[PDB]
Amino acid sequence: MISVADLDYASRKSSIFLFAPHVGTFTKQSMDKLVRPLAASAHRDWILDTVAGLPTYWDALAVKIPNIGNAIPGRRQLTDLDTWFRHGAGDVTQDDATLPSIVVGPLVVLIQLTQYWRYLELTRPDHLEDSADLQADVVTRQTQPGAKVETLGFCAGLLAAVAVASAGNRQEFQKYGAVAVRLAMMAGALIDGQEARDKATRDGGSVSYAIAWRGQKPGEEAARIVKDLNPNAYFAVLYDEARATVTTTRRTAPSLVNRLRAADVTVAEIGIKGRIHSPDSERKNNTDLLVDLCKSFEDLQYADAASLALPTYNNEAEGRPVSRDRGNMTEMVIRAILVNQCNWYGTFKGATEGREPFVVTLGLERSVPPTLMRSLGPHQVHYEDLADNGIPPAP
Prior knowledge:
Layout: E1 14-19, H1 28-40, H2 44-52, H3 54-64, H4 66-69, H5 74-87, H6 101-122, H7 134-140, E2 148-153, H8 157-166, H9 170-199, E3 206-212, H10 216-228, E4 234-240, E5 243-249, H11 253-262, E6 266-270, H12 281-295, H13 329-338, E7 342-343, H14 344-352, E8 358-362, H15 370-376, E9 380-382
Parallel strand pairs: 1-2, 1-8, 4-7, 8-9
Antiparallel strand pairs: 3-5, 3-6, 4-5
Helix pairs in contact: 2-5, 2-9, 3-5, 3-9, 6-8, 6-9, 8-9, 9-12, 9-13, 12-13
PDB class: transferase
Keywords: transferase
Assembly: monomeric
């Protein structure tokens, strides 16, 4: 545990707010520990308003994409989510089932956004009240020496990162935060729906593994093994120089694991179920439909790429924030998460190389590639490690 007072954040050259991906799963019990402080916080009213509205967006999604609408009880999952925040979960000890992405996506967006706001509060200038518009302040000061700010999302972290980058003040933080929650729900539904459909087949649903090798050659063998298991298996995330996340169907998982291990590749199962960053034809078609649907809702839009309040990144290793002509940010985020490979290693190296940014990770998973963490030295912090990092109850 580290105190904000011990970070020397005041001596930073710049900041990158890194919004983490999902990795591990949640139960009602484990998630309740995070939901309760959210529900008790100053964010309560805007959270409730946002979550109350989700079933309407689910309805539209179900009409647009009947294969997803018929596959999962999306409405029930979302009405239960509303009750969870509004009235409480009740006994969370009963069911050890992992929560679906249609709910975890929205919840993790909220966790990340509230951590971000609390970080601004903990590090705010001495003259500012804790009730001040902290977003307006960091955005206004971003031109001062040593006050540059960028946001950098990793997979689902893109939803929160782009919300913050779109927001010039508190009102816009709430507006674009709500957009992010809705998009997270919808992306989660596509993942969950395909998973339910897959489980009804011999191939089964999908699972993912964090893998690691040593050297060029063993990496090539790992790639060969995954390719041989195409299209069941694929590389979802390129995480570090010699680390990746691979996803495959349950049917082929033992084969994948056993062949990788025989090739001297370490393999560790991660929690998240389903297929993310997926090249599947069904996923491509569903994503095209979701993109079309989002175009029809003003309330599903982020700021335009030419109008962001702060710079932000995709996960395609550009070496710089997305260009001002990149256009529709909702489409970029949806495609980046649902279909496009996540080149995290290249993205993170690109965002940090030749610079000395203070990297602050929001979320619940450690996100800085080990080979690149060393060079960041002391100018980094993972939010979970901070003292007094609870979301404060409403004043």
